[PDB]
Coordinates of C-alpha atoms and ligand atoms in Angstrom, one line a residue:
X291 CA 64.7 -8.6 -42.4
X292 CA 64.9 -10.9 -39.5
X293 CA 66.7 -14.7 -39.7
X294 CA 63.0 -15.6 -38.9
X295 CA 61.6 -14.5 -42.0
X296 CA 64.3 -16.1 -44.2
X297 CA 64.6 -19.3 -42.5
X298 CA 63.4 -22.7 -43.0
X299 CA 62.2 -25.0 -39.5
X300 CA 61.9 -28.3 -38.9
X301 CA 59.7 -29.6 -36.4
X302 CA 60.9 -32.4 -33.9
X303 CA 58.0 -34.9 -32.1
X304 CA 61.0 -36.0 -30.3
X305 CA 58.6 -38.8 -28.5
X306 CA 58.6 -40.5 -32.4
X307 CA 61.8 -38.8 -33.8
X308 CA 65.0 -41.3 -32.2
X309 CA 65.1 -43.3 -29.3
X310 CA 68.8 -44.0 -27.9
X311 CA 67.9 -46.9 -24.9
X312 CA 65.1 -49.0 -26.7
X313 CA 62.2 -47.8 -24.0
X314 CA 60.6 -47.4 -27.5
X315 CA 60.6 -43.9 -26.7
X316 CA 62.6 -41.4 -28.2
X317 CA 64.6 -39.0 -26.2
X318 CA 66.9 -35.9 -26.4
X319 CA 69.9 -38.1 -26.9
X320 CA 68.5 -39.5 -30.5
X321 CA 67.9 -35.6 -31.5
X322 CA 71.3 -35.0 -30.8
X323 CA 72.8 -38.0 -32.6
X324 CA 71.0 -37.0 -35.7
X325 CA 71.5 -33.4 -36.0
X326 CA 74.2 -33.5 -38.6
X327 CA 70.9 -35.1 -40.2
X328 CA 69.0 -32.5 -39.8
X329 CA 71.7 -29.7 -40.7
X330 CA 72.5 -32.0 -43.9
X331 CA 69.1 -31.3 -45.1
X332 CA 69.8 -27.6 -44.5
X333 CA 67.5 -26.6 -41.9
X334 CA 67.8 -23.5 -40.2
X335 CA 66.7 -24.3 -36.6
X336 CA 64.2 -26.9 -34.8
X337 CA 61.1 -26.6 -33.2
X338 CA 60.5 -29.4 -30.3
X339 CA 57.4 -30.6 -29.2
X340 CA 56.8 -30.4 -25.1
X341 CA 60.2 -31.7 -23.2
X342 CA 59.0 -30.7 -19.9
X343 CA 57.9 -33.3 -17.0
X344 CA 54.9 -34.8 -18.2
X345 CA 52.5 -37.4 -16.9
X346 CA 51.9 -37.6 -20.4
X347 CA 48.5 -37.8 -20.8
X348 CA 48.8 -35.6 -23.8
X349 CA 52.1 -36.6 -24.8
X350 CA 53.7 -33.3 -23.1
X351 CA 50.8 -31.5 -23.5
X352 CA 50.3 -31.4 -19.9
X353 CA 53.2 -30.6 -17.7
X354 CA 53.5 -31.0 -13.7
X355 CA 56.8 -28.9 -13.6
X356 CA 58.2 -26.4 -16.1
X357 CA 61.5 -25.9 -15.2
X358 CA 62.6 -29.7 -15.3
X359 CA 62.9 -31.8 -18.5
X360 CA 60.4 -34.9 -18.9
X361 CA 62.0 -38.1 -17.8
X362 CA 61.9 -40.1 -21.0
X363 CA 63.5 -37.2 -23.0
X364 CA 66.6 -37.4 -20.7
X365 CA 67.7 -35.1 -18.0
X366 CA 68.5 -31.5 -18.2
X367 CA 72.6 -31.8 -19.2
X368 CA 70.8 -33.6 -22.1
X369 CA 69.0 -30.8 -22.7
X370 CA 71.8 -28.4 -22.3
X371 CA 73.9 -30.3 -24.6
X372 CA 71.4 -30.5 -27.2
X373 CA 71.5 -26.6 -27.2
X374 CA 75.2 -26.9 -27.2
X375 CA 75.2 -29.0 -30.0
X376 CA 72.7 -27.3 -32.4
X377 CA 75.3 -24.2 -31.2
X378 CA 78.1 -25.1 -32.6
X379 CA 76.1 -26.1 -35.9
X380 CA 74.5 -22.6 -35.9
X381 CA 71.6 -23.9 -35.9
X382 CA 68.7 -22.3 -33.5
X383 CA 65.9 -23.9 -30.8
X384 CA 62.4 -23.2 -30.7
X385 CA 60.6 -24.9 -27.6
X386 CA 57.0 -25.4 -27.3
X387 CA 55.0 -23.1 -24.6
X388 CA 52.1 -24.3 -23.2
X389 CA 50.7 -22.1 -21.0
X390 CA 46.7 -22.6 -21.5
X391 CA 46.9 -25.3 -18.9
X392 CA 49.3 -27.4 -17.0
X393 CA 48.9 -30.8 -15.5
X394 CA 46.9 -31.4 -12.4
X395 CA 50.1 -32.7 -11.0
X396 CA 51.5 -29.9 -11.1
X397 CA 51.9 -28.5 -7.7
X398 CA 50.2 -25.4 -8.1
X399 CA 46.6 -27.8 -9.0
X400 CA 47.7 -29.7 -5.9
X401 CA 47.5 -26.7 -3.7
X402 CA 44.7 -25.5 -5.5
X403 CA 41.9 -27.9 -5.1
X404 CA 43.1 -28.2 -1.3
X405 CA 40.4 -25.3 -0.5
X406 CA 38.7 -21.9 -1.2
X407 CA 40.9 -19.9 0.4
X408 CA 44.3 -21.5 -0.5
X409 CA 46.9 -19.3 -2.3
X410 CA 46.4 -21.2 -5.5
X411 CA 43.2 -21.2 -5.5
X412 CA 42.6 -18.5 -8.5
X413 CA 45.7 -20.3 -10.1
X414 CA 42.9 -22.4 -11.9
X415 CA 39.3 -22.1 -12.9
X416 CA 36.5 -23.3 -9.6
X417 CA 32.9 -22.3 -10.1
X418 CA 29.7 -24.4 -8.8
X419 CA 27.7 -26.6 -10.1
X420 CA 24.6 -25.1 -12.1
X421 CA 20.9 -26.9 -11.6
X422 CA 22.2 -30.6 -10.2
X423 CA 25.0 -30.1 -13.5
X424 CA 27.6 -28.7 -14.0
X425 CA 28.4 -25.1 -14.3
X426 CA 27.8 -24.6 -17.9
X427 CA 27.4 -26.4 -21.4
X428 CA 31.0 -26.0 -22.2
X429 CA 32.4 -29.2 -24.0
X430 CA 35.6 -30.6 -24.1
X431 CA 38.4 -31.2 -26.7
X432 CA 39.2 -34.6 -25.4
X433 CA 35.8 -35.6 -24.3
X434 CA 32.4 -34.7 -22.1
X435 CA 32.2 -31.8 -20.6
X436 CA 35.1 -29.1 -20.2
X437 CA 34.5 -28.9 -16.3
X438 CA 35.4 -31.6 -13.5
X439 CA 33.8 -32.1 -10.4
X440 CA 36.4 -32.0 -7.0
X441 CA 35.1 -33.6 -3.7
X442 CA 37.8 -31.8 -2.1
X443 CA 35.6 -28.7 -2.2
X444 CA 32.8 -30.0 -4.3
X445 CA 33.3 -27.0 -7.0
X446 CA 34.4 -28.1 -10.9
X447 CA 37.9 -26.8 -12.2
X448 CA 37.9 -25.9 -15.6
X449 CA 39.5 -27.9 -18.7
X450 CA 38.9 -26.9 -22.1
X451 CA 41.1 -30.5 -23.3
X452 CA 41.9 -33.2 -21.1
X453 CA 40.8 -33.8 -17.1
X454 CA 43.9 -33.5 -16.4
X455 CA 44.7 -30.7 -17.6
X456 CA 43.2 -27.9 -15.6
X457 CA 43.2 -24.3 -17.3
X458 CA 45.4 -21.8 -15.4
X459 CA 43.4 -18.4 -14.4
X460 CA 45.0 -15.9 -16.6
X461 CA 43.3 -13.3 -14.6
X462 CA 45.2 -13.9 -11.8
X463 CA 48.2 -11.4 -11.3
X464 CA 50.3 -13.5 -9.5
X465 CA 49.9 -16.4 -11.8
X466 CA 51.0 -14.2 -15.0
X467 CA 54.0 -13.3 -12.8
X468 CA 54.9 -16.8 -12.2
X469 CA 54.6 -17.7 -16.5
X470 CA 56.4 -14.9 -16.7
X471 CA 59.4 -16.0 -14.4
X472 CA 59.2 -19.3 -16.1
X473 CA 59.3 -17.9 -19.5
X474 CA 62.5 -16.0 -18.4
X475 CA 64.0 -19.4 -17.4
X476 CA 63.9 -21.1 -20.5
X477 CA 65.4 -17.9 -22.4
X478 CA 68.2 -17.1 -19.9
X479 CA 69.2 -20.7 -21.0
X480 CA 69.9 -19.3 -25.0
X481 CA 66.0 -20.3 -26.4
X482 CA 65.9 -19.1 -29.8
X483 CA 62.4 -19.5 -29.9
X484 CA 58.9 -20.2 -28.7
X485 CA 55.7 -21.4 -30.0
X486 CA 52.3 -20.7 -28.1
X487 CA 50.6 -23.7 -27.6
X488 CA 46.8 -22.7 -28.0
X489 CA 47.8 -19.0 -27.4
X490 CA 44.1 -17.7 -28.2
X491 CA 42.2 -19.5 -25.5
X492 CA 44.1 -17.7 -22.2
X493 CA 41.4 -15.2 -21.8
X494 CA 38.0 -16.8 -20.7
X495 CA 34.6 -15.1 -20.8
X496 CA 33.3 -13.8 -17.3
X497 CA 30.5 -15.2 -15.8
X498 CA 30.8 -18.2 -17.7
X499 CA 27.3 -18.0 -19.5
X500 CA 25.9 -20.9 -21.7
X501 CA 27.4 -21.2 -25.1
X502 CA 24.3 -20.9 -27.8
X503 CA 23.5 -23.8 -29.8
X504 CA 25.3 -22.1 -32.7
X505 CA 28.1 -22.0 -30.6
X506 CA 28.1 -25.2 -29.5
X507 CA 28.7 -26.4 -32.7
X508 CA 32.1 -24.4 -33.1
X509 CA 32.9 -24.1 -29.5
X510 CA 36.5 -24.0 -30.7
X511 CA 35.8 -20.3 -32.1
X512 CA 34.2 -19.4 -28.6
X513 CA 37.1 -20.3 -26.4
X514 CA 39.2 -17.6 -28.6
X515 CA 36.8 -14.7 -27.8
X516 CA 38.0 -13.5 -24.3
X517 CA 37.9 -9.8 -23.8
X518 CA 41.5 -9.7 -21.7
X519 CA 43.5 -11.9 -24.8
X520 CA 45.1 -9.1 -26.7
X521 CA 46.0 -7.3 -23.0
X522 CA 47.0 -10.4 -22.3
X523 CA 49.4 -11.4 -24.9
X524 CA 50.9 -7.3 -25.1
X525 CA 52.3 -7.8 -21.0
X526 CA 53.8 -11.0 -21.5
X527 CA 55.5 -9.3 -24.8
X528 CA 56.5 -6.0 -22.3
X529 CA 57.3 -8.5 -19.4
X530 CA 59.6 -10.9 -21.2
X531 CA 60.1 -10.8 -24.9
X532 CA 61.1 -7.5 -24.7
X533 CA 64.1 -8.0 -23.3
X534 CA 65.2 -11.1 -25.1
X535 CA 66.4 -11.6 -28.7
X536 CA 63.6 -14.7 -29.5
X537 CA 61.4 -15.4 -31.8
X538 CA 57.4 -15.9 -31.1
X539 CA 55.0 -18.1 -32.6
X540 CA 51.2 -18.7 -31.7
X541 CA 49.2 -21.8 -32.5
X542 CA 46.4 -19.6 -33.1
X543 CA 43.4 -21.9 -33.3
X544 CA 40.0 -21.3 -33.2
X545 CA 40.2 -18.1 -34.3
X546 CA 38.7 -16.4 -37.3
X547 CA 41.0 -15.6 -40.0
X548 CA 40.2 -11.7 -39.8
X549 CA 41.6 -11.8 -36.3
X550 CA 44.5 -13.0 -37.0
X551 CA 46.4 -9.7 -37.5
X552 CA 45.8 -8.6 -33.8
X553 CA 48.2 -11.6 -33.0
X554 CA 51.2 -10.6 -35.6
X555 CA 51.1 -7.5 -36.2
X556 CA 54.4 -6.5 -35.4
X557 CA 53.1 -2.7 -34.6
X558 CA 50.8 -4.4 -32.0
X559 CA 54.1 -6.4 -30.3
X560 CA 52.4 -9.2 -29.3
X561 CA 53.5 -12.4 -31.3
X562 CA 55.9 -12.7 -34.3
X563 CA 54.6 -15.6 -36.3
X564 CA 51.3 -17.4 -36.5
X565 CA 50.5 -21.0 -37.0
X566 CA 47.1 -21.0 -38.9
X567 CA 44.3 -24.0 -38.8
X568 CA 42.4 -22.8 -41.9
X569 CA 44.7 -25.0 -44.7
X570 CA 45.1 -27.5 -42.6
X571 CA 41.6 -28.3 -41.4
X572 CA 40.2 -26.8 -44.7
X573 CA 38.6 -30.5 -45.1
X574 CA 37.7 -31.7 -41.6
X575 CA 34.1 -31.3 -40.6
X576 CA 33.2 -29.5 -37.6
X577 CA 33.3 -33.0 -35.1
X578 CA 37.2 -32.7 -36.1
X579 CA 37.0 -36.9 -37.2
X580 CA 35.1 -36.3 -40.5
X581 CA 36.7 -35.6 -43.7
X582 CA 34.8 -32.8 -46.1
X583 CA 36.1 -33.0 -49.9
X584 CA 37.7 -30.1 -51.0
X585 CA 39.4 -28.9 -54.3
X586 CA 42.6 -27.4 -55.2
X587 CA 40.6 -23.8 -55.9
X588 CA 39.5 -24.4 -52.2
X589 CA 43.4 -25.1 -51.2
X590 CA 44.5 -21.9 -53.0
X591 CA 41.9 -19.8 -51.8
X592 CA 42.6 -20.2 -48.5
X593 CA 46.2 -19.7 -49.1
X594 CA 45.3 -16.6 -50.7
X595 CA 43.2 -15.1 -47.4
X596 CA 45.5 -16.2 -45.3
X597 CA 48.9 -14.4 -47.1
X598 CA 46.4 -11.0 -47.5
X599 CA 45.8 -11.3 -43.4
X600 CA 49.8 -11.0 -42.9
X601 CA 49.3 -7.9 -44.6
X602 CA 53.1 -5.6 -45.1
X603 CA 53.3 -5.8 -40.6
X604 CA 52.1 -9.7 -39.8
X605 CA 54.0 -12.6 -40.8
X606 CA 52.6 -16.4 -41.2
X607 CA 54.0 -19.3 -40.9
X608 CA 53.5 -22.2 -43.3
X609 CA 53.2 -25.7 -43.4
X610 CA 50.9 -28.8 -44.5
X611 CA 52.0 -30.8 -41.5
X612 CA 52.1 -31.4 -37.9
X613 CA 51.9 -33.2 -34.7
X614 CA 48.3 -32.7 -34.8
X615 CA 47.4 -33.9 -38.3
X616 CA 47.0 -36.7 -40.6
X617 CA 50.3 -36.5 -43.1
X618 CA 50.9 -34.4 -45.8
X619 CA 51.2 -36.6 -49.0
X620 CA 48.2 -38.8 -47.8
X621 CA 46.2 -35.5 -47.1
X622 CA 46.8 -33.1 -49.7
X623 CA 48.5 -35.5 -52.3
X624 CA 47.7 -39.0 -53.0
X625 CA 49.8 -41.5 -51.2
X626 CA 49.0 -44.3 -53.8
X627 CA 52.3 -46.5 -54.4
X628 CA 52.1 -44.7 -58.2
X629 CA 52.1 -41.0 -57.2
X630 CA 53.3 -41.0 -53.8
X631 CA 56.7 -39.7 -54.7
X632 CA 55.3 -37.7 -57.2
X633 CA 52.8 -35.8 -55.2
X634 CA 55.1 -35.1 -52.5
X635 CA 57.5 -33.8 -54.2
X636 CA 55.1 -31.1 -55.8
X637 CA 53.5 -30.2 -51.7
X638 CA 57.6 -30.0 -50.8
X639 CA 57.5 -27.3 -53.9
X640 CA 54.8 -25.4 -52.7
X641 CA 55.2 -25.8 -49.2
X642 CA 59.6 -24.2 -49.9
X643 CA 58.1 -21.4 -52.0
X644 CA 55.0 -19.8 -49.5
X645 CA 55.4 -16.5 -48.8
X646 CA 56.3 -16.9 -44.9
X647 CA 58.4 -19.1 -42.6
X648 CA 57.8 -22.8 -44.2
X649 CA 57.7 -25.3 -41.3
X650 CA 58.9 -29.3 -42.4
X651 CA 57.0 -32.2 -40.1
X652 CA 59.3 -35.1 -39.6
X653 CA 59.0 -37.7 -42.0
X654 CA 57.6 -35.4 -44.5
X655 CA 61.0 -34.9 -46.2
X656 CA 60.6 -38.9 -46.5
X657 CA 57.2 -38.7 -48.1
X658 CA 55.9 -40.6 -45.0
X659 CA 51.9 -41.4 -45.5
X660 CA 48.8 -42.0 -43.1
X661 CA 49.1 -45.8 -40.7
X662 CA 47.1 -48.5 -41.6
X663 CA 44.9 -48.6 -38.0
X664 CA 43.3 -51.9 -38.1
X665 CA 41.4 -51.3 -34.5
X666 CA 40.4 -48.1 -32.5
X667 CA 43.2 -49.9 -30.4
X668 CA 45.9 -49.2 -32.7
X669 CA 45.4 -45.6 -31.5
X670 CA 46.9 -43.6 -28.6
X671 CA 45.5 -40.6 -28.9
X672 CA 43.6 -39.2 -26.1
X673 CA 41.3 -37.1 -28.3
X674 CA 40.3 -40.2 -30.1
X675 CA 39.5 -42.1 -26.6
X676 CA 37.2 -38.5 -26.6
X677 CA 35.5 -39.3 -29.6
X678 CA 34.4 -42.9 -28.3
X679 CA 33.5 -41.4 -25.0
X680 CA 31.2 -38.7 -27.0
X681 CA 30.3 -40.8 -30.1
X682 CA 30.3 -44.8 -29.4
X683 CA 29.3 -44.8 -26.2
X684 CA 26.3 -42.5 -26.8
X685 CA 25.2 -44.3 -29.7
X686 CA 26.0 -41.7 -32.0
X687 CA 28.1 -44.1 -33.9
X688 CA 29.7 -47.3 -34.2
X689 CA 33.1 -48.6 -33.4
X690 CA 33.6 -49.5 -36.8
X691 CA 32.3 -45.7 -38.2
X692 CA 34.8 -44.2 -35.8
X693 CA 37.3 -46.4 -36.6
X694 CA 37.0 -45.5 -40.6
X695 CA 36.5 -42.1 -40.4
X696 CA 39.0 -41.6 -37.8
X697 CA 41.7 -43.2 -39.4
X698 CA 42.0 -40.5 -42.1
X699 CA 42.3 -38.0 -39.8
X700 CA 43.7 -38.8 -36.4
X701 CA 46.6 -37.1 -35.0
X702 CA 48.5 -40.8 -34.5
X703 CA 48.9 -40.2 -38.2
X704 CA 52.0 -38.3 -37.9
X705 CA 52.8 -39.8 -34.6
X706 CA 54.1 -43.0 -35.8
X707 CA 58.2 -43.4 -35.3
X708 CA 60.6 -41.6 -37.9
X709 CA 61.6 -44.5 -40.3
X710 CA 65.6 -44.2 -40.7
X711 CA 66.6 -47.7 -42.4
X712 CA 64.9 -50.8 -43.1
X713 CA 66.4 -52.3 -40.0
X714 CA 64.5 -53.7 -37.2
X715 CA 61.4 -50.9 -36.2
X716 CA 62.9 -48.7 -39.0
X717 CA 65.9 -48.2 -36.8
X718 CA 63.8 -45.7 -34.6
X719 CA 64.7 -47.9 -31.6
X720 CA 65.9 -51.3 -31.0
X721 CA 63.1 -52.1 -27.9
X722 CA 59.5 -51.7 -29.0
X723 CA 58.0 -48.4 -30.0
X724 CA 55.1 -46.7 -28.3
X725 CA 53.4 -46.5 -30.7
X726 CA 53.7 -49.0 -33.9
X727 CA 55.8 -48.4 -37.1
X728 CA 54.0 -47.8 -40.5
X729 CA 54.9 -51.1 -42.6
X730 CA 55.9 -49.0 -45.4
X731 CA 59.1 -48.4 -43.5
X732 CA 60.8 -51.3 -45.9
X733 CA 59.8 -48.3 -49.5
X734 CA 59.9 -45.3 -47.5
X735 CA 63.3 -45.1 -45.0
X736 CA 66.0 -41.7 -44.6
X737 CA 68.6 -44.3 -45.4
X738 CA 67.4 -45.2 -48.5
X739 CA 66.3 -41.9 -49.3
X740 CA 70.0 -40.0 -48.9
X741 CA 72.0 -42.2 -51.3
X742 CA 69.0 -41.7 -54.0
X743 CA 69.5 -38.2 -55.8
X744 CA 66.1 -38.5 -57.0
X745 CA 64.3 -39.4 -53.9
X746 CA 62.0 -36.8 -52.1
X747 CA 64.6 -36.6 -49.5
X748 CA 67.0 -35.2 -52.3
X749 CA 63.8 -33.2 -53.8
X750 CA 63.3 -31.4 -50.1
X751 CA 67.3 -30.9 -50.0
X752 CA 67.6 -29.2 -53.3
X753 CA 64.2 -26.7 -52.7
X754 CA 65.9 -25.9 -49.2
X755 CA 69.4 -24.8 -51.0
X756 CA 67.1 -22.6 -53.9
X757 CA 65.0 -21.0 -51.6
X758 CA 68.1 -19.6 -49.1
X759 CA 69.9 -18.7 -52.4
X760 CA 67.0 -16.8 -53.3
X761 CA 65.4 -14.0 -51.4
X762 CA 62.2 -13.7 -53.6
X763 CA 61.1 -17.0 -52.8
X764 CA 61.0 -15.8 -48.8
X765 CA 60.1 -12.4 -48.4
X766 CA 58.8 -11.9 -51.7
X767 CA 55.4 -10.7 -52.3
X768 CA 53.0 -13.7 -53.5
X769 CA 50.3 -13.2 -55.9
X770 CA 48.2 -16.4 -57.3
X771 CA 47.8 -16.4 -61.1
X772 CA 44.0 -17.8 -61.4
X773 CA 42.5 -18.9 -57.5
X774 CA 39.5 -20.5 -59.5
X775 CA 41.7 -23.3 -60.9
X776 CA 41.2 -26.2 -59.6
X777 CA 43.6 -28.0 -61.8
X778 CA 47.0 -26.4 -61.6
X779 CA 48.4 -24.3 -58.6
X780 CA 50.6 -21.1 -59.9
X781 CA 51.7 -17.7 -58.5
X782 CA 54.3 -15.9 -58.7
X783 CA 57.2 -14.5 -56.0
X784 CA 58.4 -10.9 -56.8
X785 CA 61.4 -9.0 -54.8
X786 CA 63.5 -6.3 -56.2
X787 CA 62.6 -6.2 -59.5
X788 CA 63.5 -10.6 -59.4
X789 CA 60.2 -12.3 -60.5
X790 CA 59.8 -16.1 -59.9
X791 CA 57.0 -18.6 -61.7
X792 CA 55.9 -21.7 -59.7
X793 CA 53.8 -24.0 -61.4
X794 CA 52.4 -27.3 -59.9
X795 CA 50.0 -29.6 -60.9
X796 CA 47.6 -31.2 -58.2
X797 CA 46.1 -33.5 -61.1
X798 CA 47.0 -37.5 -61.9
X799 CA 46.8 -36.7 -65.4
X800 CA 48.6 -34.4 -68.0
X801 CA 47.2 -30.6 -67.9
X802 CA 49.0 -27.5 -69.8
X803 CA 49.6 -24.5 -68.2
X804 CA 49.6 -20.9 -69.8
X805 CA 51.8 -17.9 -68.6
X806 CA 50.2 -14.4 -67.9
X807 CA 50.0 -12.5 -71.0
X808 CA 53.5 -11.1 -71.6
X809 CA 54.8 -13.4 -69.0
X810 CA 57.8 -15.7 -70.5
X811 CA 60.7 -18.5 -68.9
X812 CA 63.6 -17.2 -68.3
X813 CA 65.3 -19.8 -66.3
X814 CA 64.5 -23.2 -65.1
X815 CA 65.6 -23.5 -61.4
X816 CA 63.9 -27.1 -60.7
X817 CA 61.0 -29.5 -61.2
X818 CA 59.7 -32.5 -60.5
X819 CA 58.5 -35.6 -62.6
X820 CA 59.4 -33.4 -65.5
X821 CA 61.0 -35.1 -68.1
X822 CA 62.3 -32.0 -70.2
X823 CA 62.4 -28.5 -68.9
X824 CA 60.8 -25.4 -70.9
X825 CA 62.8 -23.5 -73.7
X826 CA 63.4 -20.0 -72.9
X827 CA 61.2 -17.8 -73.8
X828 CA 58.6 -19.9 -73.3
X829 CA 54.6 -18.5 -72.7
X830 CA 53.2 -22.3 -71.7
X831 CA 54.0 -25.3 -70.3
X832 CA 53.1 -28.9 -70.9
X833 CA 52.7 -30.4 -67.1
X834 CA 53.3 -34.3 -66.5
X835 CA 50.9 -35.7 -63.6
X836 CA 51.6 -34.0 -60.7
X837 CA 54.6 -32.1 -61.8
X838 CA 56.4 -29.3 -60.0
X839 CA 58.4 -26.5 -60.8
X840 CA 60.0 -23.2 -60.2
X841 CA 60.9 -20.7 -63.4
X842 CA 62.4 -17.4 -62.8
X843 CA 60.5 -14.8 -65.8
Ligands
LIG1666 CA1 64.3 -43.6 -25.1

């Protein structure tokens, strides 16, 4: 089986993670100094959020040149010896590809919108206007519609996210070529791995017709549907991955879970891994700033589709966190001073023993929650500047109902600065940060966290050593003991003739859990706010408020 498949990521915002000249941005130099960190925790290799030159309008998201490093992440020897460094630890890079779009900086845009005929022109998206509008109904991500007007020409380029962020024409030959050069760049320099930003969207629909009014309301789920995706994805696998030793990873989003195996389907050799929205967005309503309640048989449930889509050819990632997302305790656990700890030490258990590679958000490991936003100006996000362009301004909503709602689900969430001590801005940087430091830094710090054995640092350390000493709990199959429970999570990993119990409790209260008929404890290998472990032999157990654990039978 591939390191992939057995290995356990980490996932670097390095704009949050450690700043090294008090800018109050963090840079490549800050990874660097804290990878003995990292390696300490026992994390396998490190996927990096967009380090590419970057007007930053989506915090890397929308790049002007791909083959130079962007400007407040350092320069490219800092790149080079981050590389070298995570080398000589053994520890492997996965850099973030995104492909979908590039900045309208970027000198191919330039050239582009310059005129019809231009070289570039069909590097990008121009279409006219459609009855005094513009060419269709398509929305954007990050606000209004998905298509800009240029005076230059008087056509609109297309942008599924932000203005300036222009979609490249993946129907376009010579642009393929020209990824596909600069794909080649990156790997000849020793990448280990690369994630697909928004892979699903590169194909677009021809003729641009109207979205329906159903589809308007999930115009996420329509982007996905191009007819030349899969054709797509297959020649950039022939063209480049082929001939490299890397490891590939799609977000996929938008797309409908069935679909799924066309990306990862090994047979299919397009993409390795896939990064999944289903969990994740399982209780966001379709305007994406809403939150829907859910339960724990909803959580499991969708776990449960999403492990039968990998089938015995795909392979999913998994994890309950990201750059995108409100934190991990705060959304799936309860990040109440009282079961903070508690609960997220039970989502580290489930998220160490998924069937798939688990993928750790910084912070998480710390048990960082949600930020207190007092104002709409607390936020940087772009997409939330979106939703008062779309929402407050039209008089859907108020400043204050965006501001609420928002707040529980904003991407800023998980964008706050890494909190390493209680020094002075949670010794992130000694300048001030970009964005503002969650007060909580004080109770929830790395610092304090390593020298406590029973801190969720500690918790996260000693799930990381059990699951690499035990092969089960990777590439073992996964089968969920009762997905109607909404009280207590359990399944089981199995892998050669090794069977292994994990039991967690999602409740604030006590709850008792009952093996499978015939099903007994034959070794306790860890859990969390358990006061005594099970005898063995055992065919129940008596859980604590959100208490963890993992039982080989
Ligand atoms: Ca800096």
């Amino acid at each position: 089986a591939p390191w992939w498949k057995s290995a356990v990521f980490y996932q670097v915002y390095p704009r949050s993670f450690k700043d090294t000249n008090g800018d109050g941005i963090g840079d490549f130099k800050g990874l660097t100094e804290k990878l003995d960190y990292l390696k300490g925790l026992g994390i396998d290799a490190i996927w990096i959020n967009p380090h590419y030159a970057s007007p930053n309008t989506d915090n890397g998201y929308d790049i002007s040149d791909y083959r130079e490093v962007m400007k407040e992440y350092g320069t490219m020897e800092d790149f080079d010896r981050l590389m070298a460094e995570l080398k000589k630890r053994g520890m492997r890079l996965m850099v973030d590809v995104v492909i979908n779009h590039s900045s309208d900086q970027h000198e191919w845009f330039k050239s582009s919108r310059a005129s019809k005929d231009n070289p570039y022109r069909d590097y990008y998206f121009w279409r006219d206007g459609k009855d005094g509008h513009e060419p269709n109904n398509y929305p954007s991500f990050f606000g209004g519609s998905a298509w800009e007007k240029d005076p230059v020409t008087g056509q609109y380029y297309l942008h599924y996210f932000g203005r300036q962020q222009p979609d490249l024409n993946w129907d376009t030959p010579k642009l393929r070529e020209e990824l596909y050069a600069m794909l080649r760049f990156w790997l000849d320099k020793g990448v280990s791995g690369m994630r697909f930003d928004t892979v699903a969207t590169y194909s677009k629909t021809p003729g641009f017709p109207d979205l329906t009014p159903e589809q308007m309301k999930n115009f996420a789920e329509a982007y996905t549907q191009g007819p030349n995706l899969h054709r797509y994805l297959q020649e950039m696998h022939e063209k480049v991955f082929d001939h490299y030793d890397a490891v590939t990873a799609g977000e996929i989003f938008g797309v409908p879970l069935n679909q799924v195996p066309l990306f990862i389907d090994s047979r299919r050799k397009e993409l390795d891994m896939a990064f999944t929205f289903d969990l994740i967005r399982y209780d966001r309503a379709l305007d994406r700033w809403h939150t829907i309640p859910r339960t724990l048989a909803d959580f499991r449930q969708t776990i449960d589709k999403v492990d039968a889509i990998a089938g015995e050819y795909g392979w999913n990632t998994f994890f309950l966190g990201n750059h995108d997302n409100p934190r991990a305790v705060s959304h799936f656990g309860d990040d109440r001073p009282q079961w903070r700890e508690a609960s997220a030490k039970a989502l580290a258990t489930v998220t160490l023993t998924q069937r798939g590679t688990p993928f750790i958000f910084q912070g998480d490991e710390l048990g960082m929650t949600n930020y207190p936003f007092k104002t709409l100006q607390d936020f940087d996000d772009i997409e939330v500047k979106g939703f008062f362009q779309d929402y407050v301004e039209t008089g859907k909503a108020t400043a204050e109902e965006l501001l609420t709602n928002v707040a529980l689900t904003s991407r800023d969430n998980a964008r706050t600065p890494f909190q390493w001590d209680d020094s002075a801005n949670a010794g992130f940087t000694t300048g001030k940060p970009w964005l503002k430091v969650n007060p909580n830094y004080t109770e929830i710090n790395a610092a304090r966290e390593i020298g406590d054995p029973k801190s969720v640092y500690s918790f996260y350390r000693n799930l990381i050593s059990i699951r690499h000493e035990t092969p089960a709990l990777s590439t073992g199959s996964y089968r969920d003991i009762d997905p109607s429970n909404a009280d207590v999570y359990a399944y089981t990993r199995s892998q050669d003739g090794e069977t292994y119990l994990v039991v967690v409790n999602f409740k604030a209260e006590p709850r008792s859990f009952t093996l499978p008929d015939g099903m007994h404890i034959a070794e306790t290998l860890i859990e969390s706010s358990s006061p005594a472990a099970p005898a063995a032999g055992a065919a129940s157990l008596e859980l604590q408020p959100w208490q963890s654990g993992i039982y080989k039978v």
